Design a protein around this ligand. Structure first.
Ligand SMILES: O=S(=O)(OC1C=CCC=C1)[C@@H]1C[C@@H]2O[C@H]1C(c1ccc(O)cc1)=C2c1ccc(O)cc1
Ligand SMILES: O=S(=O)(OC1C=CCC=C1)[C@@H]1C[C@@H]2O[C@H]1C(c1ccc(O)cc1)=C2c1ccc(O)cc1
Lengths: 235, 9, 237, 10
């Protein structure tokens, strides 16, 4: 695998180059938010982001070396996580706000339009505030996002080790001491547990019956949801 | 045959 | 805080000394397993484990320095994670089985007794197997379990203690002769498994506070309140 | 008043 031969700088360059674009939503400032209109916005946005995420994944070193099944499995598991870390990253310099899109900047009060959504909005906001306090760097972000993709579901474990090496390389380059490197590496990885948690609780609402009935979902998104709901308790 | 499977090609 | 001034060896010693006891289940070999009897066994065991978990938590350095509300919040968030990581630890020397108690050793087919349980049994077995292949040490285990307690419900004092445990973990790896690269890699590997433990807990919790699972066996008031702490934010039917 | 809250004082 050519991914295992990359240098740290090459790894960073490839990941930075593979970054998806930031998309817009069709929000109307004159129209007040209902449960349906709010869900309609986020669903439409997430659905368009999914297509970009799928092609982004193919440009993650080592991913295209996997079988089609494992590629599908990893993406089915990680998709909401990857959407979420993207959200909290672009919301970093907007304290108390969530920048879903440049034209869609929401706070926790707007999240109360949707039953059970303000709780996850709170968690996302705390995560974004956590990244801001850590002064998370863009190079570190793309590493964390790739880790999420590969850790969601021996070759994979070799790539993960490489990204760990890459993270350490970035921190040592910033002038951090050895102790400060270990600690920061830990602080970043533990945040992934919180990202996993937010995804689990968020997905639980999303594949609920109230949530699948409120707005039309695309066939892609509908299949991403059912991949998780399969393990949910049957009433 | 899943859509995600198709998009990955 | 006197926790922040501990050495790595003092930290390990404090965590080893704080380890809860291994309890026995009330397994009754005279009757066949049913969904109810199986859930009763695991509920009874988990309930008695909770009391010991609480006392263990008080002995984790830095924890008692928090307000009662933060202590409650952390334990409410982490309890199933903590039970699970304890389960996969003691299941390590039993490939393909889950040692819930010395008198309760189950395989995945026995997990089929309860609807939707075998899927979590499968993830717990895989996690146990993963620990076994990494040759996870007891000193590393108590570090991970404490990290789960302190990390799971946090989102500055706590972050200082979490850094201390990170130092302790690295110290252990250095003492074990691992190279500097092997240290970062192993630290990363262990902490990434914590994401899977979180995933297992949320999936299991979802079943546990489902209406079906909350009415199959009697639950203690304590366990009932630990469940609700997660259940209250779940979708309202 | 929660029981967990109570036990954390014993
Ligand atoms: O976890 S959520 O809060 O999801 C819900 C949804 C309904 C009720 C409770 C939680 C999620 C985070 C953010 O808001 C939701 C949501 C979303 C994703 C897919 C959908 O089909 C619908 C919504 C969000 C989101 C959307 C796009 C992003 O790029 C990042 C996050
Ligand atoms: O996540 S579970 O698999 O939970 C269920 C339960 C029913 C259906 C699906 C998942 C859980 C893991 C292990 O088995 C279950 C279970 C349990 C925990 C609390 C309860 O009130 C009842 C059972 C387990 C467990 C019990 C004690 C431990 O020390 C570690 C794990």
């Amino acid at each position: 695998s050519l991914a295992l031969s990359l240098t740290a700088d090459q790894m960073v360059s490839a990941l930075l180059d593979a970054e998806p674009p930031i998309l817009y939503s069709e929000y109307d400032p004159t129209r007040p938010f209902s449960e349906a209109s709010m869900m309609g916005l986020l669903t439409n946005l997430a659905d368009r982001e999914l297509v970009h995420m799928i092609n982004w994944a193919k440009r993650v070193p080592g991913f295209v070396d996997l079988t089609l099944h494992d590629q599908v499995h990893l993406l089915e598991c990680a998709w909401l996580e990857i959407l979420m870390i993207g959200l909290v990253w672009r919301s970093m310099e907007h304290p108390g706000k969530l920048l879903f899109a440049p034209n869609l900047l929401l706070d926790r009060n707007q999240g109360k339009c949707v039953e059970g959504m303000v709780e996850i909005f709170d968690m996302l906001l705390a995560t974004s505030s956590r990244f801001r306090m850590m002064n998370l760097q863009g190079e570190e972000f793309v590493c964390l996002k790739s880790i999420i993709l590969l850790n969601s579901g021996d070759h994979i474990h070799r790539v993960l080790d490489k990204i760990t090496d890459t993270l350490i390389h970035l921190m040592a380059k910033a002038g951090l001491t050895l102790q400060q490197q270990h600690q920061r590496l830990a602080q970043l990885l533990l945040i992934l547990s919180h990202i996993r948690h937010m995804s689990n609780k968020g997905m639980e609402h999303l594949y609920s019956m109230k949530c699948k009935n409120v707005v039309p979902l695309s066939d892609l998104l509908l299949e991403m949801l059912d991949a998780h709901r399969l393990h949910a308790p049957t009433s | 045959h899943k859509i995600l499977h198709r998009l990955l090609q």
